[PDB]
């Protein structure tokens, strides 16, 4: 064997950014979903008047 | 399914239909069997 890797998992989420693109309705992650995409979501600006 | 069956083959308009603005949606591809594509003739002078 030339490679080692390492099998962990955190738990990551999105805290700011919603999906663009979805290639399917379903969940429990598939090959296609390798391609799925973003975008950042619109800036808010609560404040006093 | 109209007639329970239904579904024949419908094609490409021979004017419009091949949309130069569509393709695959999603960064990795597929490779598709059969693919359609637009051409011009060689009447039109070609420009960049």
Redesign the interface.
């Known amino acids: 064997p030339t490679v080692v890797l390492y099998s962990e998992d955190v738990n990551m989420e999105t805290p700011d950014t919603h999906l663009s693109?979805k290639?399917k309705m379903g969940d429990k992650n598939a090959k296609?979903m390798?391609?799925?995409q973003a975008m950042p979501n619109r800036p808010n600006y609560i404040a006093f008047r | 399914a109209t007639v329970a069956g239904a579904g024949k083959e419908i094609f490409a308009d021979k004017t419009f239909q091949p949309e130069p603005q569509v393709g695959e949606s999603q960064w990795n591809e597929a490779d598709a069997t059969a693919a359609g594509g637009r051409v011009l003739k060689k009447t039109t002078p070609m420009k960049p």
Do not use: A, N
């Open positions: 693109y290639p296609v390798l391609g799925q």
